[PDB]
């Protein structure tokens, strides 16, 4: 199908696959030859009692089987090359566009889901399609050869096995299709009953509150009867596969033997020949069963790969040309802005009109649980501006190249991630360049992480173990403020709540904060009164419709939603 | 192992596994018999040229394979019985004690995680251990047969295979242990690197701000290279698994043939016998690879069983047998209460001397994240009384058990899980018993469920899809208040935050509240603005020290954290 959309991502490796095929064919070649050894064994060897060949057989079997091995060795190792390399390029592009997809892919889908997707689906594509080639080629080496085996030994028994191969293969395809059907149509009710039990368990809370234990026991019981019965049918039918197959398959043997009379009535065969024939037939029965499942495996793989491609074929954050940005801007403004964090149910914000000029410290007071961080996250333009504009010193949203834009903002939230690295360089995500070690380490110490730098393991370049070891929320917050001291955003913002208070820590923190905000705006998530009033100014968060522009210095004289932020909302 | 702990849960089905055994032993009998049948063909059939047996035998093949079939039929279906029955009983007890873990114990795992645990671990236990018995019995039977087969043929090659088969077994056990070791060590570092990439993902926003797409791509690349390499090593070894084994088996075949030449110096065999020998040997080569991984397989099963039994071997919620609970008003009054919602994740509450007399309406305002519901939900003792008891009408909570207590109180929250029944009954999960369908349905529609229950599919006794829960949060709360109206627990507590709902729906819900708050106690999660005061009594709490709350009169009397809240902070 869509191997096209894959072949490039295989192409510059294709040579490897080729290698595979070669030995792979040899592999099943070995198979045939082993069986071939029967011919000299039985008729030529024991019939003529030529103890000569009885010295061939041992050694040649050993050798051939070693060939089977060394093939399997290299087949596996080489398909491992290509599979790994395919996984590699796949996860690479996926990584890339992932870091290109807007916050949606993290909004609509959860991290665990994506990571499962990467690892499982990539390696599934690889594994599946690979094994597809493996079987396919393994079947080619086996079937085709075994027919040639028959050929030299007996035109007749061959002819018959050939004319019958359609019958058996068709029967296999038939039963497989039947029982795919029976195993597909189930999934609906399968998920039905499973998810039913799921809701049961999710509701045990309300259950026990309402004292329905006796009821939900019986409900569990009934749905579990449904469960076990479903399982019964599933395994029953799907297990009828092998019998009927080998049943109808066995008939083959019958005809062969049934019609083995006449050609031995022609005295065509001798014992060894016959043994080779029937052996070979069974050998054939391994890959015949395989082949239908082969097409199945293509389907599984390429399906998951289409899931992939969709995740790729999703579109990154779109930009329209906005290059006009440096590291000193000063003011931000919100005209008539709307956003929708959810799908459509709860409007996030609406016709937001805000104005944070230089130095205007701000603390988010308003609709508790309106995702106040969103407004900051809107300054990040993490979302697309459904209406209005962010006039950041006279220029609109779209006169703002995303690169320098997001470079020009700093956020120190409560919960900060880092990466497994020298914590110093983790501060230095800003290319670790254009900020020298003196700058980095000194300022970082100067930025009040000193008990987290000099006292921690290895002091100056304290390294991370398992991504920050056990660094407190406060540790990471300090580290981010140190980043701010390093990056020195033209506009500096952060988020601190009522989590914890170590006097020196947050005191020197807020000191550095007002250092940053010197003639520079700032926002902080407001749940602490201490952070609210230790700085100068405090704002509204007008409950979805923020027409209000300004802090205490502005929203004090107006007597706006400060009524609610005094008595009814905060 | 823990079979001691599981056998009884199988005992009353013994006969199943017994039929399993007899059938499977027949399966091996069929295997062996066909292989035996191979002889008369070769020695008598074509050697002595007796078309008689050329006619007899083919039919025998058909028959024997029919036996294979029907046996696999019954084997599968019988193991299906026992497996399903085991799954059933297991899931049943797991439901039972799964109704015993405290709500935390419910959230100590994720709901989905426990559901996976039920479904998977149950069917894993069965499937695994069952197939273990399958392998043991069948494969052992095939071995024993094939040895007997050899015996009817030749003392000699038998003896030699008996000397050698242990060595084969040794090689297999050896390589399996080596590569289990390698796989475990990998698994460790595997988790390391995979979780590393996981974190790398989970922190987009940080990077997209700090603009390090290059840095990620590089780190992604390195860790993914590690990934491909681990893949390489894993598949490499696990693939070397087979060929060495088959090489050793090859060595077997070889020395078999050497000591076939030597009793050919004795003129040992005839063609048929010869063909039977090695054929049988390979037939054996399937089940040895079986048996080793067999003694492996229990562990997977029995491991997940231990997981299960532990989930059983948690303690159902403690009880006090105090009982003596009025189905009447009583008086709800916190005293000295100091608890914690999680194990220790976050500090919750301290010294709660809260008094709510009979009929005193209360709201829940303040620390957004103080588990205001958890106060109510702990009137239900969702956790234990860590310190400080609630004197229920002169009786501590500890002075009484949970049974009627939890029945004696109601809680109309925002999100009431419903269940797959005639939703008319869904109101009365506990003991639909003489409760007049007139009374039930009226009170429901009397309780302003009428907005939709009048207009739901089939009218009075409607169900819907998804367990009859297709209703919105609005109809959810509606029917919940209706439930309160059915049980009419003279103890009344509710939970509505009218910050979020439609206007007309809100009109209906407030009217219904009026219809239900007749002289009755009341609490409400107050993230609301207006309906906080429709009942004229509003209050607030932070800091987890609830000594002061209650009516508006009590709001006026706080003069501590809470008066300061409703006058400056909430």
Author numbering:
A (entry chain A), B (entry chain B): 11 to 580
Reproduce passages from the article.
Recently, our laboratory introduced the peptidisc as a novel type of peptide scaffold designed to keep membrane proteins stable in solution without detergent. When the peptidisc peptide is mixed with detergent-solubilized membrane protein and the detergent is removed, multiple copies of the peptide associate with the transmembrane domain, embedding the protein in a peptidisc, which can also incorporate lipids that may be bound to the membrane proteins. In addition, we show that peptidisc-stabilized membrane proteins (in this case reconstituted with the conventional ‘on-beads’ method) can be used for high-resolution structure determination by single-particle cryo-EM. Notably, the arrangements of the peptidisc peptides around MsbA and MscS are very different, revealing the structural basis for how the peptidisc scaffold can adapt to membrane proteins of different sizes, shapes and symmetries.
Using Escherichia coli MsbA, we show that peptidiscs stabilize this ABC transporter as effectively as MSP-based lipid nanodiscs. In particular, the cryo-EM map at 4.2 Å resolution reveals that the peptidisc preserves the native conformation of MsbA as well as its interaction with its lipopolysaccharide (LPS) cargo. Image processing revealed subtle conformational variability in the distance between the two NBDs, as illustrated by the two final density maps at resolutions of 4.2 and 4.4 Å. The slight mobility of the NBDs in the nucleotide-free state is the likely reason for the somewhat limited resolution of our maps as well as the previously published cryo-EM map of MsbA in nanodiscs (also 4.2 Å). The final model was obtained by docking the cryo-EM structure of MsbA in nanodiscs into our 4.2 Å density map using Chimera, followed by refinement in PHENIX. Like in the nanodisc-stabilized MsbA, our map showed clear density for LPS trapped in the transporter, which was not visible in any of the X-ray crystal structures of detergent-solubilized MsbA . However, unlike the EM map of nanodisc-stabilized MsbA, in which the nanodisc is seen as a large amorphous density, the EM map of peptidisc-stabilized MsbA shows clear tubular densities surrounding the transmembrane domain of MsbA that represent the α-helical peptidisc peptides. In the case of MsbA, we identified a total of 15 and 21 helical segments in the maps of conformation 1 and 2, respectively. Most segments run almost parallel to the membrane plane, with tilt angles of less than ~15° for 8 and 14 segments for the maps of conformations 1 and 2, respectively. In the case of MsbA, the protein in peptidiscs has a higher ATPase activity than in detergent, as was seen for the protein in nanodiscs, and it does not adopt the artifactual conformation with widely separated NBDs observed with detergent-solubilized protein.
